[PDB]
Write an enzyme that holds these catalytic residues in place. Structure first.
Site, PDB file in Angstrom:
ATOM      1  CG  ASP A   5      38.528  -8.837  60.213  1.00 19.73           C
ATOM      2  OD1 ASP A   5      39.565  -8.431  60.775  1.00 19.73           O
ATOM      3  OD2 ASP A   5      37.569  -9.376  60.816  1.00 19.73           O
ATOM      4  CB  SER A  27      55.499  -4.535  69.408  1.00 25.52           C
ATOM      5  OG  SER A  27      56.127  -3.269  69.431  1.00 25.52           O
TER       6      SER A  27
END
Length: 330
Positions: free
Chosen positions: A35, A199
């Site tokens: 994770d 992004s």
């Protein structure tokens, strides 16, 4: 040193991925959910409330000649999905894919919430976010990667998750046969303890690319792709009959649909998520309403590049003095 371990989807939907991990002496192998959005290595154990164990493999520290109680240390964690766990702490030897850390904090669960009990395939979590998020008190503990880093050939790990197939976590090296083209690296902020990056935009299907900054986290422990409501609406507007359902808890679409791809930007590069990766199947057994793999992050407080996005790429978690993230097509 290096390590290399195969990671395997837990079910036909890729709801999560499990990676075998050796703990203790002699080794006890548990299948852990790696994770990159948390920083605790915790396991079902011989200390876990018996009624909360239902099929998981447990770590028994009393059977490990290298286990030592970390005296006074406790831990307690809550995840974004509302699940939680807590317990005490041992140090022990932990190996992943041939890479060994001695003295790793292994957090032994005394209590786990219902969703963990109900998932027999996940024996615990191995956190790979920054150690500043680790919950052990009163002495915070380091992640497996943080402990291994100095010994690694290169201070990196990579995630290569499969679509409906096994993939690989590598530690200490970049497998240049595992991706196509070049790796595009992008800046990371560690201020919130996550692999947080920006992004450069998105496209829906064959549509034109929209240049827009989307800050979010690379999170292997989250199944879906969670993005701003504007982006998510633009995606689902291209699917006939798709709608946001408050009763189901997100966007659903007709199971008869063919989904468009979704592209996200990494610098000037582009990662394409095929439409099939965005299908999470019937909302309930036998339903013709299917659950979408791109959902709104509104109300979560952060955008999350979960498995839906990451499995479309070869992802480098670069733990150099200034961390960065790398993405390549594959």
């Amino acid at each position: 040193s290096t390590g290399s371990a195969t990671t395997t989807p837990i079910d036909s939907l890729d709801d999560a991925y499990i990676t075998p991990v050796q703990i203790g002496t002699p080794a006890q192998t548990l299948n852990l959910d790696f994770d990159t959005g948390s920083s605790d290595l915790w396991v079902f154990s011989s200390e876990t409330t018996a009624s909360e164990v239902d099929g998981q493999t447990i770590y028994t520290p009393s059977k490990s000649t290298t286990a030592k109680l970390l005296s006074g240390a406790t831990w307690s964690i809550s995840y974004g999905d509302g699940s939680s766990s807590s317990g005490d702490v041992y140090t022990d030897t932990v190996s992943v894919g041939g890479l060994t850390v001695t003295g790793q904090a292994v957090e032994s669960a005394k209590k786990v919430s219902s969703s963990f009990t109900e998932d027999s395939t996940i024996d615990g979590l191995l956190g790979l976010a920054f150690s500043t998020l680790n919950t052990v008190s009163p002495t915070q503990q380091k992640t497996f990667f943080d402990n291994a880093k100095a010994s690694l050939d290169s201070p990196v790990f990579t995630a290569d998750l499969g679509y409906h197939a096994p993939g690989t976590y590598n530690f200490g090296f970049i497998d240049t046969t595992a991706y196509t083209g070049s790796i595009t690296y992008t800046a990371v902020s560690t201020k919130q303890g996550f692999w947080e990056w920006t992004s450069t935009g998105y496209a829906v299907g064959s549509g034109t690319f929209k240049s827009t900054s989307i800050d979010g986290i690379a999170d292997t422990g989250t199944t879906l792709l969670y993005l701003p409501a504007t982006v998510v609406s633009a995606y689902w507007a291209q699917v006939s009959g798709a709608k946001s359902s408050s009763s189901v808890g997100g966007y659903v679409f007709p199971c008869s649909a063919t989904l468009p791809s979704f592209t996200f930007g990494v610098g000037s590069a582009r990662i394409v998520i095929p439409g099939d990766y965005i299908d999470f199947g019937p909302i309930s057994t036998g339903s013709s309403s299917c659950f979408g793999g791109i959902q709104s992050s509104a109300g979560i407080g952060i955008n999350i590049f979960g498995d839906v996005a990451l499995k479309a790429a070869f992802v480098v978690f670069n733990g150099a003095t200034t961390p960065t993230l790398g993405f390549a097509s594959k």
